[PDB]
Amino acid sequence: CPLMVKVLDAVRGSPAINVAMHVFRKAADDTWEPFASGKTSESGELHGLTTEEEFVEGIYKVEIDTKSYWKALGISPFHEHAEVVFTANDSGPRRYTIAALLSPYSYSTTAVVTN
Amino acid sequence: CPLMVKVLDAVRGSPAINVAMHVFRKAADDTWEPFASGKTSESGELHGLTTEEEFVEGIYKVEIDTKSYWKALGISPFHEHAEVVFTANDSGPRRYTIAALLSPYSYSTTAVVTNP
Amino acid sequence: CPLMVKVLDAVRGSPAINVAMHVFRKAADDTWEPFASGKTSESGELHGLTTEEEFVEGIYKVEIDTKSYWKALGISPFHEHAEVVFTANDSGPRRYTIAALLSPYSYSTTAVVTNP
Amino acid sequence: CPLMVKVLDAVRGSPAINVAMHVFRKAADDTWEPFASGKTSESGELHGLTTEEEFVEGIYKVEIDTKSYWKALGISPFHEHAEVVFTANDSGPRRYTIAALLSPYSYSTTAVVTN
């Protein structure tokens, strides 16, 4: 897995489960085309997004339906979703782990790039 | 000021100065109409982006151009930028303060919303 | 004000009001001498804890009593409190702004430090 | 493992490796006695701190030498260390995962409580 996403709930201190998300690549005319989607498991993680063969260097956009997570939980969020936008490098270490910590009015996002 | 943004540098423990930002609105056709743009000051803050009259009900997006900030200081950051999307003013006028904290491989963001 | 603290609620998207804090200093014998205490205001901010003259070189600790904040709102938080330790003024007088962001199971903290 | 700690570097986007830390229990006269210590591995994680038999309900304090991490890296930190203080519950779910995200002038800490 070259690209993995882990989401967390800062309110209950548990993984954020059944969080829908959609990944995107910036096309040459700078529009976002679907690339991958899925929902976080019971560990709040989602793997097998892509393959290193399909995962070529470029601008990518992960989009987390954070609003729908809180909605279903009966809580009023601030954000419509959370978007993570980065360039996938090749020369550089190429195992991306993206983590999002979620609260109603706040979220944080970090990238762990390893070999 | 019904909408303000504040940025800090987590690496230097200081306001993030000269940070460029673009604000967008979601048109009836679901595209991002331009709404306002600016640069944080010496205090890392951006004010007077809009007005009570112009800042109506809608879904807005603030895009903080963090990459270009990090480059100037010799750093290759992870994120192209930081994006903030939210519905505003759907139950009357509110005031929105957006805070962004920036690290090369991480950023956080928070909303203070006040009934004026 | 050479030292200030600001607290926000990440759950309500608002300043964290009536939050009690205790500031300590590290004595020559390595114990925590009391230094100052207070409660955040309506704006979630605490000012005038000390002074330039009284705020000398040292290792200080700010302890933010977050548990008692969450209880009052019906929540059982994870952390007993939030602690901030740092050396201050070891290369001349500085001004310190401490920011705390609070969730029931998470908190962040940031320092802005300015040469006056 | 009832008690695990994962630390991350927000500057380089890698796990924080070889981070020393010390855990503590609040004694009846409210002093902190050593309970456990160790250093984070190459995954920036540290496990096998205690056992669920030794891990009785009480006030605990994890102490992360964040200053020494940055020091060795040639970077000037703000904090002397990072302290996480919580009550270990029994009735409640009892697998604690503590995560600390580290920058020179800032850090965040979150708890994931699971079964």
Tab-separated table of all heavy atoms in Angstrom, chain B residues 5 16-17 65 72 80-81 96:
chain	number	residue	atom	x	y	z
B	5	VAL	N	-9.012	35.504	9.325
B	5	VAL	CA	-8.117	34.363	9.334
B	5	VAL	C	-6.812	34.709	10.077
B	5	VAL	O	-6.223	35.786	9.885
B	5	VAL	CB	-7.826	33.837	7.876
B	5	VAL	CG1	-6.859	32.641	7.932
B	5	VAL	CG2	-9.198	33.508	7.179
B	16	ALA	N	2.627	33.728	11.008
B	16	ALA	CA	3.069	33.386	9.685
B	16	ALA	C	2.715	34.601	8.801
B	16	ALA	O	1.585	34.896	8.519
B	16	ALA	CB	2.463	32.065	9.241
B	17	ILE	N	3.759	35.315	8.432
B	17	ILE	CA	3.692	36.600	7.725
B	17	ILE	C	3.720	36.470	6.188
B	17	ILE	O	4.354	35.574	5.670
B	17	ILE	CB	4.880	37.446	8.186
B	17	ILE	CG1	4.733	37.830	9.630
B	17	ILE	CG2	5.085	38.752	7.374
B	17	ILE	CD1	6.049	38.571	10.098
B	65	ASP	N	-2.385	29.498	1.020
B	65	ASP	CA	-1.293	29.076	0.192
B	65	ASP	C	-0.005	28.839	0.998
B	65	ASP	O	0.913	29.641	1.020
B	65	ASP	CB	-1.102	30.155	-0.929
B	65	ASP	CG	-2.381	30.371	-1.745
B	65	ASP	OD1	-3.137	29.361	-1.981
B	65	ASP	OD2	-2.643	31.541	-2.132
B	72	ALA	N	9.960	29.983	0.541
B	72	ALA	CA	10.691	31.238	0.878
B	72	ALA	C	11.640	31.094	2.072
B	72	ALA	O	12.578	31.874	2.254
B	72	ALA	CB	9.728	32.335	1.092
B	80	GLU	N	-0.002	21.125	-0.699
B	80	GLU	CA	0.046	22.212	-1.701
B	80	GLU	C	-0.499	23.508	-1.118
B	80	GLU	O	-0.048	24.596	-1.428
B	80	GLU	CB	-0.794	21.789	-2.932
B	80	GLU	CG	-0.171	20.609	-3.713
B	80	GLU	CD	1.099	20.997	-4.349
B	80	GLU	OE1	1.179	22.093	-4.958
B	80	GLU	OE2	2.066	20.221	-4.141
B	81	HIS	N	-1.540	23.324	-0.328
B	81	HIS	CA	-2.172	24.366	0.450
B	81	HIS	C	-3.079	23.786	1.498
B	81	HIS	O	-3.204	22.536	1.655
B	81	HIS	CB	-2.938	25.421	-0.452
B	81	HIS	CG	-3.831	24.827	-1.485
B	81	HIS	ND1	-3.439	24.653	-2.806
B	81	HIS	CD2	-5.090	24.329	-1.396
B	81	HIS	CE1	-4.414	24.061	-3.478
B	81	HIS	NE2	-5.431	23.865	-2.650
B	96	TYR	N	-16.960	34.770	11.775
B	96	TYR	CA	-16.122	33.644	11.635
B	96	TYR	C	-14.697	34.002	11.754
B	96	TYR	O	-14.183	34.881	11.078
B	96	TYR	CB	-16.337	32.910	10.300
B	96	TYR	CG	-17.787	32.480	10.150
B	96	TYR	CD1	-18.742	33.357	9.689
B	96	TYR	CD2	-18.185	31.179	10.439
B	96	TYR	CE1	-20.102	32.964	9.514
B	96	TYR	CE2	-19.478	30.797	10.300
B	96	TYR	CZ	-20.443	31.718	9.847
B	96	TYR	OH	-21.782	31.288	9.761
